[PDB]
Amino acid sequence: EVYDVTIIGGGPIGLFTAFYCGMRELKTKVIEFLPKLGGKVSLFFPEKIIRDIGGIPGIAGKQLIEQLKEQAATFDPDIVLNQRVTGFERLDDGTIVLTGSEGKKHYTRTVILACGMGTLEVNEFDSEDAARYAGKNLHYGVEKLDAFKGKRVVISGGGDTAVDWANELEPIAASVTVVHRREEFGGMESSVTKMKQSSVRVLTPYRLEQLNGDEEGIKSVTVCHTESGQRKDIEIDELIINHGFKIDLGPMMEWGLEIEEGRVKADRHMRTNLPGVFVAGDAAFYESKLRLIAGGFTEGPTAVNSAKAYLDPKAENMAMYSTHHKKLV
Ligand SMILES: Cc1cc2nc3c(=O)[nH]c(=O)nc-3n(C[C@H](O)[C@H](O)[C@H](O)COP(=O)(O)OP(=O)(O)OC[C@H]3O[C@@H](n4cnc5c(N)ncnc54)[C@H](O)[C@@H]3O)c2cc1C
């Protein structure tokens, strides 16, 4: 089954892009790597108030994503979750075939890359967990030390930032536990020796295996000794994950895209160098690019208009205004 447009990425930009595809009557598919939509907003700032979106004085990340899902839903596009698009090829008739890393074949006339700077992966940490506990008592760093006062804190990680975070948290937290899969740590050794001798509880060599929680938040983590294979359940009031991020374009590297600074070069029409392949949102590279949600909200529709022109040169330059759009009023 051949789609007119397949959008790679279901972040905020992919969602609005899908809506605009619907306005221009294109048969539309969105493909997202995570188990839920909303991209960096959903994973990294769902609880924060965004104030730099045109026309919206203040909105919580999560609420923006609900509103963008509502927009995306308008014309009922097909949403594909839990798939990393890694393969690209062209059929004889110009149809593009996208391959998911599990062999899944998707057929399309055009592609819009709304993939940001890559799949949103945290090293050795489950996407499902990242999505489920976002905005709760899951952190990827220490914003302010005072919020951790009196709390039982676990830090998973073995780098310098992990060891330093433990040392400045030890005076403030009810308790600090550091979980790491190797007995050796990063940073200056004085910081390690200090942590190791302080009341910080140092759990090595242990692997973080699982997060145990409810609707309110994470309540323990199950860890496994990397040698004996013995399981422990460690109590959690706050979990800080410091494993590092794995955010990159991966096998799209080998599609022959013109790439600059980890992003995909876009002309003013949001065209890449690959015919039928357009780009929008944080994925787009050009000099004056606005690396905001507001930027993506212009690039998306621009990309749809170019896709539409590419499928039919005699199409109107853009969709009708929403206020006089025949399917909306
Ligand atoms: C802490 C923080 C605060 C921020 N605050 C603001 C703010 O106040 N205002 C603002 O405008 N912006 C802010 N941003 C930036 C904002 O997050 C981005 O501009 C926005 O997320 C871009 O959306 P996007 O859809 O282009 O990319 P993303 O949100 O990165 O979404 C892209 C999606 O594509 C998926 N994906 C990637 N590759 C593939 C593939 N190959 N196959 C399938 N799926 C794939 C990814 O998993 C991801 O979910 C902030 C960012 C951070 C980290």
CB of 30 closer than 8 Å to CB of 10: yes
Q: What is the DSSP letter of 80?
A: E
Instruction: Tell me how far apart the alpha carbons of residues 225 and 76 are, in angstroms, rounded to a whole number.
Output: 47
Nearest to 135 by CA among 11, 40, 45, 41: 45
* Terminal Cα-to-Cα distance of the chain (whole angstroms): 30
CB 38 less than 6 A from any atom of ligand 1: no
**Experimental technique used?**
X-ray
Q: Residue written as tokens 């899908």?
A: 18
Before 251, cis peptide (omega within 30)?
A: no
Before 313, cis peptide (omega within 30)?
A: no
Q: What is the DSSP letter of 146?
A: G
**How many residues are there in the chain?**
329
Q: Which residues are CB-contacts of 277 (< 8 A; sequence separation ≥ 6)?
A: 96, 110, 111, 113, 257, 271
From the CA of 83, how far away is ligand 1's center (Å)? 17
CB 80 less than 6 A from any atom of ligand 1: no
Resolution in A: 2.1
Instruction: Tell me how far apart the alpha carbons of residues 70 and 309 are, in angstroms, rounded to a whole number.
Output: 26
Burial of 182 (0-12, 13-18, 19+ CB in 10 A): exposed
Instruction: Tell me how far apart the alpha carbons of residues 120 and 282 are, in angstroms, rounded to a whole number.
Output: 12
Atom of ligand 1 nearest to the CA of 251: 41
Q: Tell me the CA distances in angstroms from 120 to 36, 46, 117, 196, one per residue in order.
A: 12, 15, 8, 33
Backbone dihedral angles phi then psi of residue 231, each to the nearest 5 degrees: -90, 140
Amino acid (one-letter) located at 30:
V
Q: 56-64 long-range contacts, Cβ below 8 Å, gap at least 24?
A: 61/135, 62/38, 62/135, 64/12, 64/293
Distance of CA 182 to the CA centre of its chain: 28
Instruction: Tell me how far apart the alpha carbons of residues 153 and 142 are, in angstroms, rounded to a whole number.
Output: 11
CB of 39 closer than 8 Å to CB of 62: no
Report the nearest-CA residue for atom 49 of ligand 1.
39
Strand partners, 234: 221
Strand partners, 154: 177, 239
Instruction: Tell me how far apart the alpha carbons of residues 141 and 224 are, in angstroms, rounded to a whole number.
Output: 23
Three-state DSSP class for residue 207? strand
Backbone dihedral angles phi then psi of residue 172, each to the nearest 5 degrees: -105, -40
CB 140 less than 6 A from any atom of ligand 1: no
CB 31 less than 6 A from any atom of ligand 1: yes
Instruction: Tell me how far apart the alpha carbons of residues 41 and 38 are, in angstroms, rounded to a whole number.
Output: 6
Q: Name all domains of the chain by residue range, CATH numbers in brackets.
A: 1-123+244-329 (3.50.50.60), 124-243 (no CATH)
Three-state DSSP class for residue 261? coil
Q: Residue written as tokens 């330059």?
A: 317
CB 46 less than 6 A from any atom of ligand 1: no
